[PDB]
């Protein structure tokens, strides 16, 4: 019944599903808040989808992320990818396309690996 949006963030074998919907503004990773995501030195790697665009985008929506697999740093990279492209997809579908591609421009100017992973490797020289 609610406007909701589901995205995916992947690094090596971690995978994070982020559901974004309209709400009061709560960002929850694995049930716990976002301010508990260990190893606590990469908590700003998790935070930078919020601090790159401002918390006034997150003031009206609530995100929840479920992260399985991987290790510590692969899980924080999956979390930040899921949060970033979930915010982009929510502003695409339920807010205007101008804020959509402003968010895409800001995340892509920081690093496009917030939005597109580096996936299939190696190179056979």
């Amino acid at each position: 019944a609610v406007p909701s949006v589901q995205t995916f963030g992947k690094k090596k074998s971690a995978t994070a599903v982020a559901h974004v919907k309209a709400g009061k503004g709560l960002i929850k990773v694995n049930g716990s808040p976002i301010t508990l995501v260990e190893p606590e030195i990469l908590r700003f790697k998790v935070y930078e989808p919020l601090l790159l665009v401002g918390l006034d985008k997150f003031s009206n929506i609530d995100i929840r992320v479920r992260v399985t697999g991987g290790g510590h740093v692969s899980q924080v990279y999956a979390i930040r990818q899921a949060i970033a492209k979930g915010l982009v997809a929510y502003h695409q579908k339920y807010v205007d396309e101008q804020s959509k591609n402003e968010l895409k421009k800001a995340f892509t100017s920081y690093d496009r690996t917030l939005l597109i992973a580096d996936s299939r490797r190696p190179e056979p020289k």
């Binding site: 807010v95 205007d96 396309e97 101008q98 804020s99």
Partner: protein
């Protein structure tokens, strides 16, 4: 772009909403008296506002800075932005029309001659003329290249609205009495009119320059004709041999 709408309130504050989702995006507060004109570039990069305190503000739009502010000598009643040439015209309170460009922020023409309040005005689609209409029951056309008044119409009803077509086809005026829309066609779409001022170098009045035949007797000069005549003369045997049909016609 169609994304942004701009509201200019009577307490001097421009608010910028998104047309798709309907919410406040930005809010500029420069003027203190009523904002009577807002426009923006064709590249969404510089906006221009004019209030009836007689300041034209020039803002960057992507960055939210102001690029400058220019104080005119009368309260401004109406702005029209010609968007391809980046020239906007202001109907001031001293009954002049100030034509000012937004790139370098200078008053570049100032058109005098109206006797009462300018009700409306509009640019030509090529941006060469500006047609205004005012409460002295008149409609004037100004050639802003030369800066003078090309034509004038005394019309019995006061024309309250003047709009050109976005092609150069039609002028649409709207008067005080009459429930309809009066429609005019510019004869200068079919002929060329002289930009020579009315009141109450014929090639430069008709915006042409017929190129002179040779500039100096010590200068080589080709023929006034097609360039291909030399090649036709030099190789007209092989061109006609090409042009023959492949077998002889049946006579």
């Amino acid at each position: 772009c169609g994304n942004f709408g701009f509201i200019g309130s009577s307490n001097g504050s421009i608010t910028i909403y998104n047309m798709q989702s309907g919410i406040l995006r930005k809010k500029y507060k420069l003027h203190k008296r009523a904002v009577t004109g807002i426009s923006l570039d064709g590249m969404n990069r510089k906006m221009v506002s004019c209030g009836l305190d007689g300041i034209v503000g020039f803002y960057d739009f992507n960055k939210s800075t102001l690029l400058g502010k220019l104080k005119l000598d009368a309260p401004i009643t109406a702005m029209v932005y010609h968007r391809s040439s980046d020239l906007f015209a202001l109907a001031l309170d001293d009954l002049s029309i100030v034509v000012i460009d937004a790139v370098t922020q200078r008053v570049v023409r100032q058109l005098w001659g109206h006797s009462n309040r300018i009700t409306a005005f509009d640019f030509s689609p090529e941006g060469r003329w500006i047609v205004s209409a005012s409460l002295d029951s008149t409609i004037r056309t100004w050639d802003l290249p030369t800066g003078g008044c090309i034509d004038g119409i005394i019309v019995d009803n006061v024309a309250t609205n003047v709009k050109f077509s976005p092609n150069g086809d039609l002028l649409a005026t709207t008067h005080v009495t009459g429930n309809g829309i009066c429609i005019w066609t510019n004869r200068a779409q079919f002929k060329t009119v002289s930009t020579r001022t009315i009141d109450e170098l014929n090639d430069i009045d008709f915006n042409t320059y017929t190129s002179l035949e040779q500039i100096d007797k010590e200068l080589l000069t080709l023929s006034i004709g097609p360039r291909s005549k030399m090649n036709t003369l030099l190789h007209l045997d092989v061109i006609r041999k090409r042009s023959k049909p492949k077998e002889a016609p049946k006579k």
